[PDB]
Amino acid sequence: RDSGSGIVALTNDRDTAYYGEIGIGTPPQNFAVIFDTGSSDLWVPSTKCDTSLACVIHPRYDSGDSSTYKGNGTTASIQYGTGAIVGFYSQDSVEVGDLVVEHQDFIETTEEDDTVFLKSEFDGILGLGFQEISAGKAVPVWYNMVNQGLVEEAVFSFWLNRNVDEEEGGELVFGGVDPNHFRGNHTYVPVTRKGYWQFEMGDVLIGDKSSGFCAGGCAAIADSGTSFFAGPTAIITQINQAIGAKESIVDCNGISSMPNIAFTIGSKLFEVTPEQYIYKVGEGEAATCISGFTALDIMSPQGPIWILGDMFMGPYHTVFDYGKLRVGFAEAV
Ligand SMILES: *[C@@H]1O[C@H](CO)[C@@H](O[C@@H]2O[C@H](CO)[C@@H](O[C@@H]3O[C@H](CO)[C@@H](O)[C@H](O[C@H]4O[C@H](CO[C@H]5O[C@H](CO)[C@@H](O)[C@H](O)[C@@H]5O)[C@@H](O)[C@H](O)[C@@H]4O[C@H]4O[C@H](CO)[C@@H](O)[C@H](O)[C@@H]4O)[C@@H]3O)[C@H](O)[C@H]2NC(C)=O)[C@H](O)[C@H]1NC(C)=O
Numbered sequence: 110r111d112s113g114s115g116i117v118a119l120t121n122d123r124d125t126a127y128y129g130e131i132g133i134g135t136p137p138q139n140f141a142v143i144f145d146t147g148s149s150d151l152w153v154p155s156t157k158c159d160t161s162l163a164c165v166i167h168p169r170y171d172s173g174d175s176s177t178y179k180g181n182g183t184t185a186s187i188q189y190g191t192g193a194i195v196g197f198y199s200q201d202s203v204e205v206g207d208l209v210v211e212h213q214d215f216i217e218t219t220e221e222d223d224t225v226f227l228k229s230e231f232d233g234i235l236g237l238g239f240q241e242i243s244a245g246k247a248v249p250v251w252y253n254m255v256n257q258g259l260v261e262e263a264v265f266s267f268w269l270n271r272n273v274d275e276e277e278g279g280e281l282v283f284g285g286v287d288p289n290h291f292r293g294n295h296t297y298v299p300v301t302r303k304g305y306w307q308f309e310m311g312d313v314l315i316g317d318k319s320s321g322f323c324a325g326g327c328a329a330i331a332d333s334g335t336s337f338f339a340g341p342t343a344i345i346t347q348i349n350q351a352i353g354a355k356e357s358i359v360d361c362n363g364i365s366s367m368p369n370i371a372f373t374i375g376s377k378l379f380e381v382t383p384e385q386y387i388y389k390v391g392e393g394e395a396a397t398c399i400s401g402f403t404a405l406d407i408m409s410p411q412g413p414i415w416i417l418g419d420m421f422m423g424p425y426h427t428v429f430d431y432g433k434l435r436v437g438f439a440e441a442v
């Protein structure tokens with residue numbers, strides 16, 4: 110018997126990535142998978158991938174051992190940074206949060222860029238975005254969940270633990286919201302373009318006044334798969350100066366003197382402190398403090414795009430409300 114809580118416990122790897130276990134096939138084949146609101150496919154290493162080290166060192170899906178496996182074979186290609194992942198589609202049963210999602214299309218990977226995925230603790234990615242941005246326009250896991258009636262509410266939500274010393278890395282809830290992990294109300298903004306979890310954002314404040322560049326209305330995406338913030342160079346440039354910044358972007362030891370950065374979502378200020386937006390790769394005084402604000406210029410018909418990753422979704426409990434097409438943020442506890 111498999112039903113029906115919808116809870117997934119998340120592992121936190123040095124605040125950089127969050128992953129949980131899913132099962133594919135019967136009998137189930139277990140994979141560590143990042144839950145990613147920025148992409149829409151499910152993919153895992155395949156037994157048919159013999160030229161990439163990542164597939165060889167990670168657990169691999171074997172269709173010959175699944176009695177529910179149904180061949181497809183449609184090829185697909187997904188760019189990850191400079192390289193890419195490549196594979197073909199298959200169908201099988203997927204168990205996420207003890208919900209058995211029947212006939213799920215997913216990608217068996219044939220090749221993986223070893224620079225990103227060789228030393229990953231996770232094996233795959235479970236995409237939680239919309240169908241429009243799936244490689245083969247596959248029906249995403251969450252849509253099948255909704256379609257099979259496996260959830261009481263048409264929302265899913267994230268608690269990401271930012272304290273890497275604790276034992277709970279985080280928690281992802283399919284079909285509800287865990288009231289233990291936020292305080293006060295969520296602020297809800299509607300989805301502006303449907304493929305991405307995308308909404309309208311206001312002006313970005315450095316210290317107490319305006320960056321000007323987003324005061325006319327920017328676009329932004331909640332992407333559980335990214336750690337760092339990414340936004341237009343025109344704003345990132347100003348942030349770099351007010352912080353003392355110099356591949357990456359460095360400083361340190363002046364964190365407490367830096368200003369808070371604040372995003373204006375739903376006519377409210379969501380503030381991020383230096384402690385929350387500076388990443389610390391070291392530990393002592395040979396430590397390396399790195400800025401989480403990376404420059405990235407992508408257009409959309411709604412304006413230049415901000416990516417708000419785990420550094421934002423950590424302090425701000427995030428609800429993805431599919432039934433009302435809206436995203437909500439609340440102060441996390
Ligand atoms: C190899 O894989 C690729 C990648 O997936 C296949 O190419 C894609 O296949 C999908 C699925 O057929 C295509 O999406 C559909 O497009 C339809 C036309 O827009 C649309 O009606 C579909 O939306 C409905 O269904 C989903 C749920 O899908 C169920 O049924 C399919 C059948 O295979 C399964 O794949 C799923 O697991 C699931 O069982 C709902 O979420 C959606 O809201 C729609 O639901 C209506 O219909 C349901 C009954 O069908 C009913 O239950 C609902 O209440 C509602 O009335 C879906 O978007 C996609 O277009 C296609 N890609 C391309 C580029 O064409 C490829 O076909 C496959 N190849 C082989 C050889 O198998």
Ligand SMILES: *[C@@H]1O[C@H](CO)[C@@H](O[C@@H]2O[C@H](CO)[C@@H](O[C@@H]3O[C@H](CO[C@H]4O[C@H](CO)[C@@H](O)[C@H](O)[C@@H]4O)[C@@H](O)[C@H](O)[C@@H]3O)[C@H](O)[C@H]2NC(C)=O)[C@H](O)[C@H]1NC(C)=O
Nearest residue numbers: 286291292293294295296297375376377428437438439440
């Ligand atoms: C945190 O968020 C909460 C929202 O989730 C806030 O509480 C809500 O506040 C609004 C506005 O004050 C209330 O909405 C109004 O309620 C009246 C009366 O509702 C009653 O009658 C209707 C039938 O007409 C019935 O369906 C209801 O069940 C009630 O019996 C409506 O007529 C108005 O049009 C309007 O919707 C919400 O009711 C209220 N919700 C809750 C759960 O309290 C809360 O104030 C926020 N807190 C802070 C600090 O901002």
